[PDB]
Write a protein that binds this ligand. Structure first.
Ligand SMILES: N[C@@H](CCCC[NH3+])C(=O)O
Ligand SMILES: N[C@@H](CCCC[NH3+])C(=O)O
Ligand SMILES: N[C@@H](CCCC[NH3+])C(=O)O
Ligand SMILES: N[C@@H](CCCC[NH3+])C(=O)O
Ligand SMILES: [Cl-]
Ligand SMILES: [Cl-]
Ligand SMILES: [Cl-]
Ligand SMILES: [Cl-]
Ligand SMILES: [V+3]
Ligand SMILES: [V+3]
Ligand SMILES: [V+3]
Lengths: 252, 251, 249, 244
């Protein structure tokens, strides 16, 4: 009921978090560019995530688009997955209002320590990626915007791959990504996830990817992309492979 | 696959459990009739559970059977669920071999503090319950056998119901179940479950049930029933194998 | 300090508590007659605790009075400890001001769910108990007043004893029936660590401290408060302020 | 009374598995440090209480206040008890084959009690500025008994830098700190920890006020462990030239 969702989520977060504990999560987010909301520290009520997982699962069964390309602006890292564009996820009233919820964005703003602005490009507001076959992966890349709340809806067993790897405190130079060079100079943090987890990712300064699936499994995530004040900046690269599969940077 | 699963499991358990921590779990088992293996205290590797889940998913879509009955031997409590009979689950080489694994049965024997014998009735070796609709429930009852390892494969949101309620330290008298009377005299322990959890249940002396679903959802579990040394079957109440058993009532 | 204690305590508590989580503490307080403020639920900043403990250490060395009698109004339960009188602790401006602090009583009122009135008897306003030898205990008893905030300033290891044992939802009678109540009810034992604070519903919770197994230091501070029901007093058993009370033995 | 190796081998067998100990070995090799706390006890609580009582040997309480030259003039401000300790309880457990056998699964190599009889060390820091300054160890292994630990807000934590080496002529202390990160290990009363004392630069943080920090060191040795150089040996001989 939108207003009832926010009123409940407010109580839900007030039952689990305090200003001191959020400040500890803010420290972790700035150190790793990543904070995980697992069974210990939940972010949304289990009934709410179920509702989100069902609305996403329906969008996959109808709108799934296979992608298998290389993105030149990220050192030609692979993008082997199925996607659901943002223009089609925006039809879901639940996912659309929740991604602009004053309660959710305000709570997470305590972790980012800066205003979270739900005003990003229409083709990037929401993204659903669905990896099914072996070698499927979201290759090393950066995000155009500052923040993204990722819903780890369905994750394979950790022995099948699919983990999130991350290198924080970097930046995206599209004219020269230096992806493999950065790995040589920095330690990689591997973040395993379990079905039901959510995590906040600082997408613009954290080089990240998903470990390829070593065997046929199912990896479904929902991405809510948000902006910071620094992102409100012209979009460059012509590398929007999730919307346009034959972008000027998408080589196959 | 095959006998390599016992070696993987023997390592999986050695990495997490010690005789001291198992003895602590054994204390909880006798106190509650219930020990939960959740995200903190896993029991089987994630890949192994996924393989068991996928085998049960297929068994459901292949040989599901709807049950909607009351059981006279358990005070006419409702059984409202779909099931897959033990005869069909035994077609799974993985599930049947894992139900008789010496390392799995051996580890759990430290929690039961007694030998776990994998010799039970052929219509009760395995069982799958599939609750899908509102008011679906596995009503108040006991187990004819002592032990049951329950795989909480798919569990609905906690706000929709489906929790295990239990009353430990009771007994099943099929001529006078005294279920509602036991509730009046004893406290009820409610056990929330999440998808992926397993739990060991002392089914003969723990009055238990699943909280009915408050809305359409999905609740899928697998039952591995084992026997103790204390375990002749009476009651004519084997409703999961025979929907028209003597004790099975209608409406 | 003085008026700085309130601004510091209000800022300290507002960062570690929400009205929703305080409600969860209020449930636990009505259930067990007891709620512990430990490393997971701090109540005062570390500086305020140090100043209170440091002040309490001086009051112990200067004016220690040992008690060792049996109280008839609590079934002849033993009271083997050293104590410091209330009028003595009232001289400390820090303890007296913190005892009436609108921020402290205001926060704790959300746990009791009723008004906490700092109007009690002059001889029972504050209390320090120091047990140093074996077989020392504050025997089974109740409280004449509703609420008491206890400062577990120095607590021995659990293996030495000194834990708080409690039976909530009782009352204090001419006929205490203490061992009978233990037979009919079951006892909650609450272990305490150095620096812990806990709120106790003293009028309805039969409570004691487990006797010391060996020589060990056990130092606490009681800040007794009252509720609306505590506004008529009897017993002739005020042993802490009068060791020659009519109930002592 | 030789009844310790039996009660210890049972105490450890029900609290550790070979795969659990292998995880402790990785932690020991990476940090040079493995702490035995409430989650991973090493001795029964009665045995430690007997050691804490036996050590409380301090009968030999000799204060120290020097600067060791082979460690860049880092301070040594504490009391000591000389290896006086060789009490039959500490001596028997130090050569206990069950204890040295289990701990060898963490070091991944055999540990030998054949060390200089100069063996056991009891540290007793009391006043402020008391510290066991930056240093290494002439021997590989040492099991430290944090018998009594002040609260963390006062100091006493162990700061360690693994994967280093001791050059008595050029200790390179502050320069090593600039190039390596410092691991701070907080300790509580009752914890024990195994320390690779030769390749781990370590120290205790100086106490911020008068407190009580009591420790017992049982220095063992390894096969790769030579000659005693530096003329340091400050815990034994207070006037050993290498002091200050
Ligand atoms: N730029 C990202 C896509 C961002 C989608 C929203 N976080 C990539 O190359 O995969
Ligand atoms: N006795 C149980 C059936 C157990 C089947 C699984 N072991 C009941 O009446 O519901
Ligand atoms: N009346 C209590 C002591 C109360 C002290 C003030 N709260 C007793 O008999 O021990
Ligand atoms: N060699 C160390 C002392 C070790 C004493 C024996 N465990 C130092 O220079 O401080
Ligand atoms: Cl991204
Ligand atoms: Cl059953
Ligand atoms: Cl009282
Ligand atoms: Cl050393
Ligand atoms: V991304
Ligand atoms: V009292
Ligand atoms: V040393």
């Amino acid at each position: 009921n939108v207003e009832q969702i926010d009123e409940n989520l407010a109580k839900f977060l007030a039952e689990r978090y305090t200003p001191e504990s959020v400040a500890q999560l803010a420290d972790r987010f700035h150190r790793f560019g990543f904070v995980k909301f697992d069974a210990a520290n939940r972010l949304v009520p289990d009934e709410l995530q179920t509702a989100v997982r069902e609305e996403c699962d329906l969008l996959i069964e109808q709108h799934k688009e296979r992608r298998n390309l290389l993105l030149s602006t990220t050192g030609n890292t692979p993008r082997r997955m199925s996607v659901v564009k943002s223009e089609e996820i925006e039809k879901s009233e639940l996912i659309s209002t929740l991604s602009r919820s004053e309660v959710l964005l305000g709570f997470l703003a305590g972790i980012t320590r800066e205003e979270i602005i739900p005003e990003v490009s229409s083709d990037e507001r929401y993204l659903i990626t669905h990896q099914e076959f072996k070698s499927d992966t979201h290759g090393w890349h950066w995000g155009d915007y500052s923040f993204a709340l990722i819903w780890a809806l369905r994750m394979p067993p950790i022995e099948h791959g699919g983990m999130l790897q991350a290198v924080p405190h970097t930046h995206w130079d599209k004219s020269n990504p230096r992806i493999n060079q950065t790995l040589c100079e920095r330690e990689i943090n591997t973040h395993g996830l379990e079905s039901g987890d959510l995590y906040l990712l600082r997408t613009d300064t954290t080089l990240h990817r998903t470990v390829p699936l070593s065997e046929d499994s199912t990896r479904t995530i929902l991405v809510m992309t948000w902006a910071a004040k620094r992102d409100l900046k012209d979009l460059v690269g012509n590398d929007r492979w999730w919307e346009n599969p034959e972008a000027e940077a998408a080589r196959a």
